[PDB]
Amino acid sequence: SNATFLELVEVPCNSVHVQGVMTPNQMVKVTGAGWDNGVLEFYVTRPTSRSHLASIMCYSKDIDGVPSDKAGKCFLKRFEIDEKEVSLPIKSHNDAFMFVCSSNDGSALQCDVFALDNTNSNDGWKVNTVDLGVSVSPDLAFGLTADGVKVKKLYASSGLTAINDDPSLGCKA
Amino acid sequence: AGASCTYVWSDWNKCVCPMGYQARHAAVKFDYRNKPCDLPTFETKACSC
């Protein structure tokens, strides 16, 4: 492991590529203070290049042009298997957000999704747990695909090993 | 003003058994012009199991 006691290690790259399996009680974390435009997509990929495994897509309620049947809603895409709406606290690109994903028992992959209203920051975070409908497997990768994510930060708990020196993943040289 | 570079803490999650610890999360709101935000964004504490 990478620490005597559990801590979250910042990943100096554009995504978190876990080496090995997602051990129970370990987690990967992605945070941001908001984003600029378009949809916010939190994605999970697996080997075999690589392929998408699951994606959470959140549409802002504060962006002109977003269809009314999508505005302020989040959707879970699985691979494609299907797409379905999920109840998450992220409503706007002006919201701060946190994704904390883990395996509850070595099989199911789940994420705690947090949202904070930047106009009422003293009110704290609202949280919902969403099951990603997929099972964990070796060498999963986590990241964001969005336009202008503000103060994007990535973490991996110290019992996990994430790639931190690959320039192909945007890792700082 | 002295704004905090981290957002406020989330709630503590459910106690993890039988290891006996729970965790809570924060996030960086901004980095300083001269240094990265140095306030904690992750904390653990012992709980009864």
Numbering used by the authors:
A (entry chain A): 44 to 91, 98 to 128, 135 to 228
B (entry chain B): 596 to 644
Sentences from the paper on this structure:
Microneme protein 2 (MIC2) and MIC2-associated protein (M2AP) play crucial roles in the gliding motility and host cell invasion of Toxoplasma gondii. Complex formation between MIC2 and M2AP is required for maturation and transport from the microneme to the parasite surface. MIC2 contains a von Willebrand factor type A (VWA) domain and six tandem thrombospondin type 1 repeat (TSR) domains in its ectodomain. In this study, we report crystal structures of M2AP alone and in complex with TSR6.
The TSR6–M2AP complex structure was solved using the M2AP crystal structure as a search template, and the TSR6 domain was manually built. Like other TSR domains, TSR6 in the complex has three parallel strands, with a stack of aromatic and basic residues forming π-cation bonds on the layered side, although the number of stacked residues in the layer is lesser in TSR6 than in typical TSR domains. Notably, a presumably layered residue, Tyr-602, adopts a conformation out of the layer, and a water molecule is positioned within the layer and hydrogen bonds to TSR6 residues Thr-601 and Pro-635. The complex structure reveals that the rod-like TSR6 domain binds through its non-layered side onto the hydrophobic face of the M2AP β-domain. The TSR6–M2AP interface buries a total of 1460 Å2 of accessible surface area. At the center of the binding interface, Lys-72 of M2AP forms a hydrogen bond interaction with both His-620 and the main-chains of Ala-621 and Thr-636. The His-620 of TSR6 additionally forms extensive hydrophobic interactions with M2AP residues Met-70, Met-153, Val-155, and Phe-169. At one edge of the interface, Trp-180 of M2AP inserts into a valley contributed by TSR6 ribbon residues Tyr-602 through Ser-605 and hydrogen bonds to the main-chain of Val-603. Remarkably, the H620A mutant decreased binding by >5000-fold, showing that His-620 is a hotspot in the binding interface. Furthermore, there is an attenuated peak at −61.50 ppm in the spectra of the complex, which can be assigned to a small population of layered state for either free TSR6 or in complex with M2AP, because the layered state of tfmF602 shares identical environment with or without M2AP. These NMR findings support the notion that Tyr-602 undergoes conformational equilibration between two states, and that binding to M2AP shifts the equilibrium towards the flipped-out state in which the Tyr-602 participates in the interface.
